Scaffold this active site. Structure first.
Site, PDB file in Angstrom:
ATOM      1  CG  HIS B  41       0.986   0.256 -13.494  1.00 16.08           C
ATOM      2  ND1 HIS B  41      -0.030   0.534 -12.601  1.00 16.08           N
ATOM      3  CD2 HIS B  41       0.991  -1.074 -13.756  1.00 16.08           C
ATOM      4  CE1 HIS B  41      -0.632  -0.625 -12.370  1.00 16.08           C
ATOM      5  NE2 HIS B  41      -0.022  -1.628 -13.023  1.00 16.08           N
ATOM      6  CG  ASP B  86      -0.782   3.703 -11.522  1.00 11.88           C
ATOM      7  OD1 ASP B  86      -0.506   3.899 -12.730  1.00 11.88           O
ATOM      8  OD2 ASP B  86      -0.879   2.558 -11.004  1.00 11.88           O
ATOM      9  N   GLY B 180      -3.647  -7.899 -13.335  1.00 10.17           N
ATOM     10  CA  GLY B 180      -4.564  -7.938 -14.468  1.00 10.17           C
ATOM     11  C   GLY B 180      -5.809  -7.093 -14.213  1.00 10.17           C
ATOM     12  CB  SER B 182      -3.503  -2.835 -12.436  1.00 12.72           C
ATOM     13  OG  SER B 182      -3.005  -3.574 -11.343  1.00 12.72           O
ATOM     14  N   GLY B 183      -5.881  -0.807 -13.220  1.00 10.13           N
ATOM     15  CA  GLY B 183      -6.483   0.107 -14.167  1.00 10.13           C
ATOM     16  C   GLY B 183      -7.984   0.119 -14.162  1.00 10.13           C
TER      17      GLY B 183
END
Ligand code: NA
Lengths: 54, 232
Positions: B41, B86, B180, B182-183
């Site tokens: 995402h 994701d 922020g 995320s990932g």
């Protein structure tokens, strides 16, 4: 001595072997040590290691 | 990260930051010199910065690279659900130079990645918001988060949580991943070597009592990561 008990005393990975023994192993960039259990760096900057003084 | 601590330089040398129209919009982790793993995402022109510590200070360990290819997981479909499967891989334009500040995260096979997640305690890190709807961090933050049992995790939210995701955090709130982050990585330390166990994905209200952070289970994707990022 089996992989289900304390990971076979392997630092990283364990595989059950013949005669109630285990074979340890390590991830890319490490070598299985002479003690047959530990993982030692085999490259300058192996994965997942903190090398800067903390 | 809400309720975390400042990392020391080189404490999470696999962490990267993704910069775009907004800086530190997401995190990622170094798979090897040419590949980053992040959330699908999160991924427009992206700049990856490895060796980062304080995002407002131009230091000497940063390595900035451009992204030449984006590989979302083949099952990712944002039109159906922005947060299912994701996970994505980023190919860098030029290789990173590995050093004490720029080091890959280890990735075990599927079985061991799941065993390591079952240890029940991982570290998350990132430059995300330091409070819900608050400012982004300047210095890299980190936090140890415990694994939350599935039923509790399901009772906490109206959204559906599939078996390729897990929950982590605290029943009392106050400590969580946030926007922020995320990932970025969820890692488990195994006798001094960190292994990637999850990808920071989403949540509804950072660090709110009775809510938890939702993470992608990396064990489901290790074969795909290893195949796509293989250099030899
Ligand atoms: Na910096």
């Amino acid at each position: 001595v089996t992989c289900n008990i304390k990971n076979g005393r392997c630092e990283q990975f364990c595989k059950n072997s013949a005669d109630n023994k285990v074979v340890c192993s390590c991830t890319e960039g490490y070598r299985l040590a002479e003690n047959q259990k530990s993982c030692e760096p085999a490259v300058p900057f192996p994965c997942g290691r903190v090398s800067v003084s903390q | 990260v809400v309720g975390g601590e400042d990392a020391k330089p080189g404490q999470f040398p696999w962490q990267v930051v993704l910069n775009g129209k907004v800086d530190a919009f997401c995190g990622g982790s170094i798979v090897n010199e040419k590949w980053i793993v992040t959330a699908a995402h999160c991924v427009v022109k992206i700049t990856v910065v490895a060796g980062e510590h304080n995002i407002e200070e131009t230091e000497h360990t940063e390595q900035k690279r451009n992204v030449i290819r984006i590989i979302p997981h083949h099952n990712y479909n944002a039109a159906i659900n922005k947060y299912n499967h994701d996970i994505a891989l980023l190919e860098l334009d030029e290789p990173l130079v590995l050093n004490s500040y720029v080091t890959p995260i280890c990735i075990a096979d599927k079985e061991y990645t799941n065993i390591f997640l079952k240890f029940g305690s991982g570290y998350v890190s990132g430059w995300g918001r330091v409070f819900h709807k608050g400012a982004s961090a300047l210095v890299l933050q980190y936090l140890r988060v415990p694994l939350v049992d599935r039923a509790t995790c399901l009772r906490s939210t109206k959204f559906t949580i599939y078996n390729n995701m897990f929950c982590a955090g605290f029943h009392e709130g106050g400590r969580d991943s946030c926007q922020g982050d995320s990932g970025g990585p969820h890692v488990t330390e195994v006798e001094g070597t960190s292994f990637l166990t999850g990808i920071i994905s989403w949540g509804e209200e950072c660090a709110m009592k009775g809510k938890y952070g939702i993470y992608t289970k990396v064990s489901r994707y290790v074969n795909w990561i290893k195949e796509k990022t293989k250099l030899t």
